[PDB]
């Protein structure tokens, strides 16, 4: 019975929650592979001693060294683990477009792919899709896990709009003016639950949502002018679908990535007690309000990148990563993140071409990153 | 494919909206028979003129006398028309227990039953289930249509509970006291041109939700203690399905029965443009609050009555019918409606038996009214 799972980026936020669900359901899953950057050795050590898995991948050469006994090391350590470890599912919980190679390697083994690393799909684009077979990529991201469950009840020609909900980030309601005084402390702190750093910042910049709009077009095949976004502070409703008759179906639950993770891992069977359900034993209200595009153009920028397509989406992400890094380092301002992105994108003309090989994509991201530094150093 | 529809109760609210839907979607539907009571004979004859259907039935002979060329007339006219008409869908929009025979005749023809009539299920419980085959009955009630669509979110064995939403009525969140000086007009007991003061009252009394809770059990097989009710003022979400993993699927839409009516008619294919969808260009809110059962025991009784099965639900509804009348005639106070219902059910233990024939159900009701009328006059 048990499904054989490989966890990439097991030491991270998604990763550890994934091993909890696997630990709490030994009847459904078995851990057969682990991979990490190398920055959280003690975590990785305790993960090995607990799951009893030694088939491990560590990116950092020096780190893999002082730990000893690690079969795969170096930047390709994660991709090699995938190619040589038989599994049923590969949970890609790595962060960044760097996870693009493990994703392709995973699809190529034929195993299912629990995707969390959205950047590999955004950057991969059509390249990754050709690699995947119908329904091989199961979403872990909560908006997509939701859309999936909501679409279970219908056919595409009956779908009118896909409505993605966004928390609005912690600066929701502010003006372009106020935004300029934002500091790395305010865009990486969260009052009620936690995620990784990069994903936390993108949440504040609304670029994460932009990233999810593209992930949606790619995963579900719905055109960009039929994928909506709406701010929902509570983040209880995780996404909705509107059908041609006027009916809307939506997925809801108290925030907890454990939910979409256990579903992705157990696809197509739900996992009992994976998470807590909405409690109507006590009053509450679910609010909705439109996103302010003038103050947060991030999502419009994503759509534009998407419509143009090709490696244009990889540029979008490559640019963001460089500016977000420049931002947290204290080299540029917050409004500058989206700003630097429109700049890089306005010049990405030669990249509207679909990628023929990973290389075409590495080339586009390469270009984007530099053009992004040039724009940063331009300030 | 063009489905052939038989509309029972064509001059009513559900029936005229069904005809609007059919009129605006000829490519999908076609009317091949209409049935009314005779209270609005002129409207029925005009419908004959408009649609071109001569295959009509009127219950009232007196009324039928005023026309002379009606194929089916007299008690059982509607049942005869069903048995005599070839069709793909019979829409039962009849009111009261007299809608029970037509529902049964319909199921026997094997046609799809878009069931609106509440007594068919609430009164003829086991008689209707044993008679219908799986998936033959598609609900027209907004709450049930919602649950039908949300259940596509998982298998029957993954459903942890069904959550029906109620508007709460006019005395929503009121205190047990407040309900003392409650008068008829307050409970919206107005003489509207179309539907009687009962709905508005059952809705203000939560007895409607109770009946809906009973119909839910019989339609989806979910044990009563796993059927919750929650107050939702806006009435946008119509019901939700919570699964064993914590995910909850909800169905939202602006209030318009044409939506659930167009579902039942062409299930499972959605009808383009049936109703208007939820627009999120506008900042709205969906509020939820629990129901104080100690102030509205209405729903708790429905569950007790339905757990007892047999004709006990018929008792529940008949007992309410009279009690409601007593309140509408000042004979009793508001809190007294559910209280009297409480009494009548506590003494109907004999009606726990499964009804064998339609007469078994009518008797239970004839009985419950008597007993309820007694508790009013205090005899
Ligand atoms: N956290 C959340 O709530 C959500 C996350 N996601 C997505 O899931 C993905 C991961 O999110 P998250 O867990 O929060 O990010 P984290 O920062 O918490 O973890 C990132 C993981 O990747 C590993 N890693 C970093 N670099 C490399 C490398 N070069 N080679 C191999 N492994 C590496 C890290 O190992 P190390 O121990 O050395 O750091 C770490 O385990 C992201 O793409 C994100 O967008 C999506 C929706 C929700
Ligand atoms: N209205 C709503 O929003 C909802 C209604 N429902 C249920 O759907 C059912 C019908 O609702 P609704 O349309 O509003 O009720 P209506 O009073 O508006 O219409 C009842 C219809 O049945 C006809 N009728 C009455 N008696 C007979 C008879 N003996 N033989 C043949 N036809 C007869 C009437 O004709 P005539 O008037 O000429 O006598 C009329 O066309 C009910 O059981 C109700 O509870 C469920 C959910 C929502
Ligand atoms: C959990 C998840 O899926 N995310 O994308 C984290 C970021 C998003 C977010 C932030 C906070 C919460 Cl509680 C939730 Cl459910 C989602 P956002 O809507 O701000 O972009
Ligand atoms: C012809 C005209 O102007 N009318 O207002 C007809 C209204 C008629 C009417 C009244 C109420 C209903 Cl619900 C229906 Cl279907 C039809 P009536 O039964 O009163 O004749
Ligand atoms: Mn997300
Ligand atoms: Mn209803």
UniProtKB/Swiss-Prot annotation, chains A, B:
It catalyses: 2-C-methyl-D-erythritol 4-phosphate + NADP(+) = 1-deoxy-D-xylulose 5-phosphate + NADPH + H(+). Its cofactor is Mg(2+); Mn(2+). NADPH binds at residues 11-14, 37, 117, 119, 196. GO terms for molecular function: 1-deoxy-D-xylulose-5-phosphate reductoisomerase activity; manganese ion binding; NADPH binding. Keywords: Isoprene biosynthesis, Manganese, Metal-binding, NADP, Oxidoreductase. Gene3D superfamilies: 1.10.1740.10, NAD(P)-binding Rossmann-like Domain. Pathway: Isoprenoid biosynthesis; isopentenyl diphosphate biosynthesis via DXP pathway; isopentenyl diphosphate from 1-deoxy-D-xylulose 5-phosphate: step 1/6. InterPro entries: DXP_reductoisomerase, DXP_reductoisomerase_C, DXP_reductoisomerase_N, DXPR_C, DXPR_C_sf, NAD(P)-bd_dom_sf. Signal peptide: none annotated. 1-deoxy-D-xylulose 5-phosphate binds at residues 118, 142-143, 167, 190, 203, 208-209, 212. GO terms for biological process: isopentenyl diphosphate biosynthetic process, methylerythritol 4-phosphate pathway involved in terpenoid biosynthetic process. The keyword Oxidoreductase applies. Its EC number is 1.1.1.267. Mn(2+) binds at residues 141, 143, 212. It comes from the Bacteria. Catalyzes the NADPH-dependent rearrangement and reduction of 1-deoxy-D-xylulose-5-phosphate (DXP) to 2-C-methyl-D-erythritol 4-phosphate (MEP). Belongs to the DXR family. HAMAP family: DXP_reductoisom. This is 1-deoxy-D-xylulose 5-phosphate reductoisomerase. The lineage of its organism: Bacteria, Bacillati, Actinomycetota, Actinomycetes, Mycobacteriales. The gene is dxr.
């Amino acid at each position: 019975g048990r499904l054989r799972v490989v966890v990439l980026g097991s030491t991270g936020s998604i990763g550890t929650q994934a091993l909890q669900v696997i630990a709490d359901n030994p009847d459904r899953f078995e851990v057969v592979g682990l991979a990490a950057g190398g920055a959280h050795l003690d975590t990785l050590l305790r993960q090995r001693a607990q799951t009893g898995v030694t088939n491990i991948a560590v990116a950092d050469e020096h780190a893999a060294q002082r730990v000893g006994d690690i079969p795969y090391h170096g930047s390709d350590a994660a991709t090699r683990l995938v190619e040589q470890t038989e599994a049923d599912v590969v949970l890609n919980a790595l962060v960044g477009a760097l996870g693009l190679r493990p994703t392709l390697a995973a699809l190529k083994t034929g195993a299912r792919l629990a995707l969390a690393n959205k950047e590999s799909l955004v950057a991969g684009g059509s390249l990754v899709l050709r690699a995947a077979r119908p329904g091989q990529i199961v979403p872990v991201d909560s908006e997509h896990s939701a859309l999936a469950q909501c679409l279970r009840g219908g056919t595409p020609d009956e779908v009118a709009k896909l409505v993605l909900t966004a928390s609005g980030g912690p600066f929701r309601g502010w003006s372009a003016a106020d935004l300029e005084h934002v500091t790395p402390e305010q865009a990486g702190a969260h009052p009620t639950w936690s995620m990784g750093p990069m994903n936390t910042l993108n949440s504040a910049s609304l670029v994460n949502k932009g990233l999810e709009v593209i992930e949606t077009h790619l995963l579900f095949g719905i055109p960009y002018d039929r994928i909506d976004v709406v701010v929902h502070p509570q983040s209880i409703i995780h996404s909705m679908v509107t059908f041609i008759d006027g009916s809307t179906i939506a997925q809801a639950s108290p925030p907890d990535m454990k939910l979409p993770i256990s579903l992705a891992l157990g696809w197509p069977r739900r996992v009992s007690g994976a998470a807590a359900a909405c409690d109507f034993h006590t009053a509450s209200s679910w609010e909705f309000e439109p996103l302010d595009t003038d103050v947060f153009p991030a999502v419009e920028l994503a759509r534009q990148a998407g419509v143009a397509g090709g490696c244009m989406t990889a540029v979008y992400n490559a640019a963001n990563e460089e500016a977000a890094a420049a931002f947290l380092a204290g080299r540029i301002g917050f409004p500058a993140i989206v700003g630097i992105i429109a700049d890089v994108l306005h010049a990405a003309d030669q990249w509207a071409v679909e990628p023929a090989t990973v290389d075409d994509v590495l080339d586009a991201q390469r270009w984007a990153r530099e053009r992004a530094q040039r724009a940063v150093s331009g300030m």
